[PDB]
Amino acid sequence: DVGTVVGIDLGTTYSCVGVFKNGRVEIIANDQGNRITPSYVAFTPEGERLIGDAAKNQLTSNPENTVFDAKRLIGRTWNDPSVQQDIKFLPFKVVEKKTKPYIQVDIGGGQTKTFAPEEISAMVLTKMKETAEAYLGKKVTHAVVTVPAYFNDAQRQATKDAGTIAGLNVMRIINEPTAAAIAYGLDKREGEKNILVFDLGGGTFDVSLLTIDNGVFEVVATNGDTHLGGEDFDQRVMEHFIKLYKKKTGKDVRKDNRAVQKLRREVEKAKRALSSQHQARIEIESFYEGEDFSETLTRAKFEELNMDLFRSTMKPVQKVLEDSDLKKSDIDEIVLVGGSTRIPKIQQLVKEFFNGKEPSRGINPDEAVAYGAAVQAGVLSG
Ligand SMILES: Nc1ncnc2c1nc(NCc1ccccc1Cl)n2[C@@H]1O[C@H](CO)[C@@H](O)[C@H]1O
Ligand SMILES: [Mg+2]
């Protein structure tokens, strides 16, 4: 009894779930009305577990018991140099247990608990499963889950294991760039094509070179930047206004965690607005020492603050082409994935790199990966 199989994009910062119903893909909104769910887990001092939006929106109220970025640790050993580097930037405790990086949190009443990365990802998957069950009005037991194309055996197995813990039979593990290509129907075409998938997420940047031959895919090469994403663009804008505030008032706003988070939230809203407007107002009531903040950010200033970061996305694209023994003219399809690809400067740089070639468009870049996973889930549902 596979019932309705769900397609899940289990992302580093955000996750997305789809189902194939009545001849089309349906991306499912969670209990907060959002078509994407933060891959966040929070342990409150009352012994309650919060997942997704509720966990992310409570992060500032004590940051050591809010867990995120588990995807950076999943299927990795504790002594992996990538884990040893990542834990330096993570606010919650990571300890060595059974050779792996276990996440250590306070669960209330002086109780400390330890969770494997796949246990944290299983909580995110349980939330995705509940979002789908609330929509379908039936139990969900099977899934197609996506992973980055660079994921090794242990990472793919720990992702399946996260599914098992969540009460999901992970029938297929599919590569994220392949799922995005499927969303665009590139698997349902006769002939041979070279696809460049440009995936700029919340915290990661992945570039993948795929070949498609009569519905058959091959990942030829992968590259990117494991620590480059939308969150880094927000940070550059934050640093800018923190320095401007210190110059205008003489006050260092970084002492107050609430002030910094208020700026962070408003900066992320202004950034998103700048993808369709040339100016956005950043307004914060009682920002610091009861004083209001009111500043404008132009798209031109947003672009210059992030110019090095945006242009740096070009280097991995040149690297994949070299590793694939291909030239720019050999690319038949350019697929943009990740919410950060909405940035006009990002779309402009990709277009300029490919000498005016327009990328594939029309599928929401935050949902493209879950969309493709849901197409495959539809074939498995019967
Ligand atoms: N229009 C956008 N311009 C620039 N960057 C964007 C945009 N949309 C998103 N995301 C999706 C989204 C849409 C509406 C409301 C909330 C959200 Cl999160 N991003 C960025 O994509 C990353 C992963 O969502 C984040 O860094 C996010 O800040
Ligand atoms: Mg993604």
Side-chain angles (χ1 to χ4, degrees):
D1 179 22
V2 301
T4 301
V5 182
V6 297
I8 305 170
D9 170 12
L10 179 58
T12 298
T13 75
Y14 282 99
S15 295
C16 186
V17 62
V19 64
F20 194 87
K21 190 184 191 172
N22 305 316
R24 64 174 286 208
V25 170
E26 293 292 354
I27 299 302
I28 311 172
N30 68 21
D31 69 323
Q32 290 307 310
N34 301 314
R35 293 171 52 122
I36 60 180
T37 303
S39 303
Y40 277 63
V41 175
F43 301 87
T44 74
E46 310 93 55
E48 290 290 282
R49 273 114 154 267
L50 303 174
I51 324 292
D53 294 297
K56 194 183 173 84
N57 299 328
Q58 156 276 18
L59 172 66
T60 304
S61 334
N62 185 80
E64 47 183 34
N65 298 305
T66 309
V67 188
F68 57 94
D69 275 19
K71 193 168 175 185
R72 302 199 176 271
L73 310 179
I74 198 170
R76 299 186 184 264
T77 55
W78 156 256
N79 67 6
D80 184 329
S82 175
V83 165
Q84 288 302 308
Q85 185 73 353
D86 279 342
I87 65 176
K88 294 172 172 179
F89 308 96
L90 300 166
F92 49 85
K93 288 168 193 178
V94 177
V95 301
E96 180 184 14
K97 176 169 174 175
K98 295 173 196 271
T99 84
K100 288 149 81 164
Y102 271 61
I103 294 95
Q104 191 187 105
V105 288
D106 298 314
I107 62 155
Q111 298 181 109
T112 269
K113 255 197 115 285
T114 307
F115 299 98
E118 63 271 30
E119 283 183 273
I120 295 297
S121 295
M123 292 170 195
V124 172
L125 290 174
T126 294
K127 175 67 174 168
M128 300 320 292
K129 181 187 87 175
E130 289 167 351
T131 287
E133 288 172 347
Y135 174 77
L136 290 171
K138 68 201 249 179
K139 194 192 189 82
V140 165
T141 58
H142 290 66
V144 168
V145 178
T146 59
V147 296
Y150 63 81
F151 261 27
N152 66 18
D153 297 339
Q155 287 171 303
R156 289 171 195 273
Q157 185 59 54
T159 295
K160 283 188 164 268
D161 287 353
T164 304
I165 301 160
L168 291 170
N169 179 338
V170 179
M171 298 180 73
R172 299 286 183 279
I173 286 284
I174 296 179
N175 294 318
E176 291 157 18
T178 302
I182 292 165
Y184 277 92
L186 304 171
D187 62 320
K188 291 169 177 69
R189 308 280 183 268
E190 56 193 16
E192 293 183 71
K193 302 287 162 285
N194 300 305
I195 309 166
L196 193 280
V197 180
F198 184 103
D199 183 339
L200 186 61
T204 65
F205 174 50
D206 294 302
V207 174
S208 310
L209 194 281
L210 318 180
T211 58
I212 176 73
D213 184 3
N214 292 280
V216 176
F217 291 96
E218 165 161 14
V219 183
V220 179
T222 62
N223 214 298
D225 188 327
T226 66
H227 291 277
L228 179 60
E231 287 165 347
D232 303 299
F233 312 144
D234 296 342
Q235 283 303 138
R236 289 284 188 86
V237 178
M238 281 165 76
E239 294 165 353
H240 169 77
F241 285 114
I242 288 162
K243 290 197 265 78
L244 177 73
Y245 200 82
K246 181 85 188 179
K247 133 147 175 140
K248 212 237 283 265
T249 71
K251 300 182 282 158
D252 201 298
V253 87
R254 244 115 79 260
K255 279 98 102 77
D256 180 353
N257 196 34
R258 287 275 198 269
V260 162
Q261 172 52 230
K262 277 173 177 182
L263 184 68
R264 184 176 285 114
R265 200 157 187 171
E266 296 318 293
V267 151
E268 194 268 356
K269 201 163 84 181
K271 167 189 76 178
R272 287 195 275 97
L274 289 165
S275 287
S276 54
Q277 305 158 205
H278 278 280
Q279 246 188 95
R281 294 98 135 197
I282 303 180
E283 189 182 49
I284 311 150
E285 216 180 293
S286 184
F287 167 63
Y288 191 70
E289 291 181 6
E291 306 295 327
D292 293 354
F293 180 91
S294 206
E295 286 301 322
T296 59
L297 184 68
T298 65
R299 179 185 292 181
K301 199 79 191 187
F302 171 70
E303 285 171 358
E304 58 182 290
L305 294 167
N306 285 303
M307 210 46 105
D308 58 308
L309 298 178
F310 294 163
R311 73 160 65 252
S312 80
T313 69
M314 298 296 98
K315 290 102 155 180
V317 181
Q318 190 54 262
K319 284 250 212 289
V320 288
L321 295 175
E322 287 170 15
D323 289 0
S324 299
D325 289 309
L326 292 173
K327 289 104 252 288
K328 289 166 185 203
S329 61
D330 293 313
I331 302 310
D332 302 298
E333 301 300 343
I334 305 153
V335 177
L336 308 179
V337 176
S340 294
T341 64
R342 298 165 194 276
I343 298 163
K345 186 54 69 177
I346 291 291
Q347 281 162 353
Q348 204 189 317
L349 285 164
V350 172
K351 192 188 170 185
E352 277 159 16
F353 190 88
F354 287 105
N355 312 110
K357 183 169 170 69
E358 286 287 349
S360 298
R361 18 174 50 238
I363 298 152
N364 189 111
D366 295 294
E367 301 166 357
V369 171
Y371 193 112
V375 169
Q376 300 288 110
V379 179
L380 296 167
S381 300

